[PDB]
């Protein structure tokens, strides 16, 4: 039946982060050049500290014709408008402004360009920043911004297909005053916005194109009986429709998805990575356990029983090299693990080390072979986090932590 505890969920104190590194997004602005899609940017430079004030005005006026930003989970690279070039984010600024916002629409105007631009760029789920909502025509008026969503909503439709209630994200800003950029507006400045900041929204979004159109990769968390086989799990990478094959990796065994259900037990057709899932599946599915991966049949998910580690133990040890045995937990998985080539330790700075240590100890680190008694599927930390993340336990509470680096045949 269920699993108790995910691999993460078995883990604490800040020692997580230096290993466990940001998630790399690439982010790209759309929009006229007087919207301030370019002194959006600047701004998010300057309020996230990657710039200084003068810096931020000299972005300003350079506009007049690799830069990157942080959120608490992740690093945005942001790309330039018109793979390492394929954006996850899509960011369309748009003029608040009186006059201004109409004439993107009117006979000259760049808005049906500018969405035309989001959909050849592979943006299906647009974020459109309502701007200037701090100038004299716009007062963080509701009426205003009610009026300026309400007609992007409909010509994003009627130019580029783009359905509002699933595809859109709108919000309000100001990338003047920073307003709600990084923190939410003030109660006594805007009332009645309640939602989240961009950068807050850009922080735990979860539509993100290249892991939506990346192989279907969903770890099994649970496995119950309905009314029928249920596999429940998080979609780590990729997208899944009602009636889809999927394979169980390591085992090579496919099966047929007849249905879908979210948190709420309410029947959905389609689910992506982020989320929360519950699959009734057809076929054969007597071999499959927990910590095994539903993933595409074309591309599926890796699985090895060789991989390089980075590490860093955490309590008791003092024990052998190139053969120390403990349960891994790279997701949901669970297994059993033993060091081939102890190579590393690294400190400070994670620069290398010279010499291949004997032994491990409270406070030291790795990078070196790893290998399995039966294979698990994973993949590189820097490929899909929670796919090589993992805590080691040695027969009680705790011992380790790591990533993956590379796989083995």
């Not at 307003?179 to 950068?199: E, F, I």
């Not at 799990?233 to 009636?243: R, W």
């Not at 499959?288 to 390089?308: D, E, M, W």
Request: proline share 3%; charged share 25%.
């Amino acid at each position: 039946t269920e699993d108790a505890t995910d691999l993460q969920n078995e883990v604490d104190q800040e020692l997580l982060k230096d290993m466990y590194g940001k998630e790399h997004v690439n982010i790209v602005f759309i929009g006229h050049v007087d919207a301030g899609k370019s002194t959006l940017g600047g701004n998010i430079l300057f309020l996230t500290g990657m710039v200084d004030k003068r810096t931020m005005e000299k972005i300003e006026r350079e506009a007049k014709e690799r830069a990157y930003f942080e959120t608490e989970h992740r690093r945005f690279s942001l790309l330039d408008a018109p793979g390492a070039s394929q954006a996850d984010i899509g960011v369309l600024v748009i003029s608040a402004r009186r006059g201004e916002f109409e004439a993107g629409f009117e006979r000259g105007g760049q808005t049906r360009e500018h969405a035309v631009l989001a959909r050849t760029q592979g943006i299906n789920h647009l974020v459109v920043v309502i701007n200037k909502m701090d100038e004299p025509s716009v007062q963080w008026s509701e009426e205003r911004y009610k009026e300026c969503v309400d007609k992007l909503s409909m010509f994003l439709r009627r130019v580029a297909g783009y359905n509002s209630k699933t595809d859109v994200k709108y919000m309000p800003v100001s990338a003047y005053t920073g307003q709600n950029v990084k923190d939410r507006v003030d109660s006594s400045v805007c009332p009645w916005y309640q939602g989240p900041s961009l950068l807050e929204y850009l922080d735990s979004m979860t539509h993100l194109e290249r892991k939506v159109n990346a192989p279907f990769i969903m770890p099994i968390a649970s496995k119950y009986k309905d009314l029928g086989t249920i596999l429940e799990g998080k979609i780590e990478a990729g997208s899944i429709k009602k009636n889809s094959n999927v394979l169980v990796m390591p085992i090579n065994q496919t099966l047929e998805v007849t249905a879908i259900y979210d948190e709420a037990d309410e029947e959905i057709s389609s689910s992506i990575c982020g989320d929360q899932v519950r699959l009734r599946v057809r076929g054969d599915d007597s071999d499959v356990q927990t910590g095994y991966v539903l993933t595409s049949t074309k591309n599926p998910v890796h699985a090895t029983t060789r991989f390089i580690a980075q590490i860093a133990i955490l309590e008791l040890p003092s024990i052998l090299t190139t053969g120390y045995s403990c349960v891994m937990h790279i997701h949901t998985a669970v297994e059993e693990v033993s060091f081939a080539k102890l190579l590393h330790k690294l400190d400070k700075t994670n620069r290398k080390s010279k010499k291949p240590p004997m032994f491990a100890t409270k406070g030291m680190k790795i990078i070196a072979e790893l290998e399995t008694q039966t294979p698990v599927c994973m993949e590189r930390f820097e490929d899909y986090q929670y796919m090589g993340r993992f805590t080691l336990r040695d027969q009680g509470t705790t011992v380790a932590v790591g990533k993956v680096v590379k796989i083995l045949d």
